[PDB]
Amino acid sequence: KTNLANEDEAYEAIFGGEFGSLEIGSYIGDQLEMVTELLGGDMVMSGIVPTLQNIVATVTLGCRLDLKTVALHARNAEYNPKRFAAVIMRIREPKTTALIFASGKMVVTGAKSEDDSKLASRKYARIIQKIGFAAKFTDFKIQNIVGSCDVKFPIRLEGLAFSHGTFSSYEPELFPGLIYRMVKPKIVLLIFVSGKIVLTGAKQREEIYQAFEAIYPVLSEFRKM
């Protein structure tokens, strides 16, 4: 019943996964590799500070788009309408990917700052104007921010899963480590046994830091020694 050649289904899928738009790489190309790629930028409260690994933004271009025309005249662009009802377009700087729907909605991913996200988004809109559409850059919203961290010590995940069972789950079909669902701020932390962490669900980078600040004393209690 899930048919991604329908635009409403294709758009809803980017955001409808278990971890939301953290999984966007599945539509621009596995469960485990999608998370572990976020641990490999150039880097990843004792000198430890998170870093931004991905930002997902949405933009309304404001006109209906003919996707075959967009794909034809854009350089690095793929349009397989049977596989997925959107054009996949990439630019080199800021290195990003955009998904462009017939309704003029655009999803932009791959930037590591909020300013890079907005500039790349403006570039994709300009590319579509230059092909010959009444696109306008409107309604820029950052939808998700993914951060990563490394506390540089091993974690006794098995004690933490029990002690914080109310906020935690071990779901190996989804993730080999621990899925920590923080209440305030509302952030999902994917905790590996080695001490690396992926944080997701933020709308502002402050929430990434607040989630890390809250979880660091907890993980110290569970340092494997």
UniProtKB/Swiss-Prot annotation:
Question: One cellular component GO annotation, for this chain's record?
Answer: nucleus
The UniProt record lists the keyword Transcription regulation: no
Q: Where in the cell is it found?
A: Nucleus
Recall the GO molecular function terms of this protein's record: chromatin binding; disordered domain specific binding; DNA binding, bending; DNA-binding transcription factor binding; RNA polymerase I general transcription initiation factor binding; RNA polymerase II core promoter sequence-specific DNA binding; RNA polymerase II general transcription initiation factor activity; RNA polymerase II-specific DNA-binding transcription factor binding
Entry keyword Cell wall biogenesis/degradation: no
Segments annotated as sequence repeats: 52-128, 142-219
Which UniProt keywords are given for this protein, alphabetically ordered?
A: DNA-binding, Nucleus, Repeat, Transcription
Q: What does this protein do?
A: General transcription factor that functions at the core of the DNA-binding general transcription factor complex TFIID. Binding of TFIID to a promoter (with or without TATA element) is the initial step in preinitiation complex (PIC) formation. TFIID plays a key role in the regulation of gene expression by RNA polymerase II through different activities such as transcription activator interaction, core promoter recognition and selectivity, TFIIA and TFIIB interaction, chromatin modification (histone acetylation by TAF1), facilitation of DNA opening and initiation of transcription.
How this chain assembles, per its entry, is:
Binds DNA as monomer. The 1.2 MDa TFIID complex is composed of TATA binding protein (TBP) and the 14 TBP-associated factors. One copy of each TAF1, TAF2, TAF3, TAF7, TAF8, TAF11, TAF13, two copies of each TAF4, TAF5, TAF6, TAF9, TAF10, TAF12, and three copies of TAF14. Interacts with TFC8.
Q: Which family does it belong to?
A: Belongs to the TBP family.
What protein is this chain from?
TATA-box-binding protein
Species the sequence originates in: Saccharomyces cerevisiae (strain ATCC 204508 / S288c)
Residues of the whole record sequence present: 61 to 240 of 240
